[PDB]
Structure 1
């Protein structure tokens, strides 16, 4: 299809079109990307991702068209302590993507250790909400919580300082305009606090014509829940 759209105002238990990977599962009408114990408490060493089953036609080489897309979602992070880790990310990747071996902790379940910073070895565009930046393990991170745009590397091509708020839902809008090639990210808390980050990227040189979209999250030794509360997505192939 030239156009595709879907909306999950909430996430009931009887899902049919979601691909669950790792520890991801539905709990209380929401998607819990990372594992939680009996009493809904976050645990260490866990990775989880979800992908929508239908493939998205991002660009078409024959017609020279590229899709414009918009992804709107909300999530909350909760942790018994304050150094919650590691973060959640919205990502776009080849249809057969799977959790890379040893991609836990700071790699957010998106990259493999040996190639995490090699752009020519990966095929992924992601918007990360990174809450852990200890320089001993996350050497590629700026020294503060941040939202970042990742293009084939865990080392973001662009970041903006962000504030982690335990238990508060963050509303996010990610938009890609094929006319300008700008990938824009706007995130807001209910009180109006806003964060913005954008980057120019030619999706045609990074990803295949057909892709899958979804979310990924992980917790290494430090932990927190990564709760995806709602998600809507729309894409339309356009002539630039």
Structure 2
């Protein structure tokens, strides 16, 4: 299809179009990307991802068209620790994507250790919300941030962000094929706003058909990564 859209105002347990990977599962009308104990508390060493089943037609060679898409979602992070980790990300990748071997912790379940920083060994665009160390994650700034990843865990750009325990963050990620701008706008309920944009030609990074979803992980330090709602729309346009 040239156009596709779906909306999950909430996530009831009865799902049919979601692909669950790792420890991801539905609990309390929300998606818990990372594992939580029986009491609902986060645990260490966990990775989880979800993908929408239907493939998205991102671009089409024959017609020289590229999709204009919008992804709106909200999530909350919670942890009894002073340093909850590691983060959650919205990502776009090839349809057969699976969790890479040893991609826990700072790799967010998105990249394999051996090629995490090799743009030629990866095909993925992701928007990450990182809450976690200059000794391990020697590739990220010295503070929580929102980062745009293009075939590498080493963000092409980042902006400072504040982690607020248990508070929902509303995010809108849009891509405009005419300007090739990928824009990210995130807000907390009190109006605090964060914005970051990057110009990228998706045709040179991703295949024509892709899948979209979310990934999260916790290493030694942990926190819940709760996806509360998600709406997505994409339509092929002439450029």
State the alpha-carbon separation in 2 of the partners of residues 32 and 201 from structure 1: 30
Residue number in structure 1 paired with 2:211:
212
CA positional deviation for 1:163: 0.1
Q: Report deviation, 1:108.
A: 0.1
For residue 30 of structure 1, what is the aligned residue in structure 2? 30
**TM-score when scaled to structure 2?**
1.00
Task: Mark the runs of 5 or more structure 1 residues left unpaired by the alignment.
Answer: none
How far apart, CA to CA, are the structure 2 residues paired with 1:239 and 1:200? 18
CA–CA separation in structure 1 for the residues paired with 2:117 and 2:138 = 11
Task: In structure 2, list runs of 5 or more residues that go unmatched.
Answer: none
Q: Deviation of residue 189 (structure 1)?
A: 0.1
Distance in 1, Cα, partners of 2:47 & 2:14: 22
How far is 1:81 from its partner? 1.3
Question: Structure 2 CA distance, aligned partners of 1:38 and 1:30?
Answer: 16
Q: How large is the RMSD of aligned CA atoms in angstroms? A: 0.3
Partners of 2:34 and 2:143 in 1: CA distance: 22
- Partner SS for 1:119: coil
**Any idea what SS the aligned residue of 1:204 has?**
helix
Q: C-alpha displacement at 1:22, in angstroms?
A: 0.1
Encode CA deviations 1:151-185: one digit per residue, 9 max, x unaligned: 00000001000000000000000000000000000
CA deviation map 1:93-139 (0-9, x unaligned): 0000000000000000000000000001100000000000x011101
4+ runs of 1 displaced by more than 6 Å?
none
Post-superposition Cα deviations, 1:9-47, rounded to whole Å, max 9, x if no partner, equal 000000000000000000000000000001000000000
Aligned-partner SS, 2:221: coil
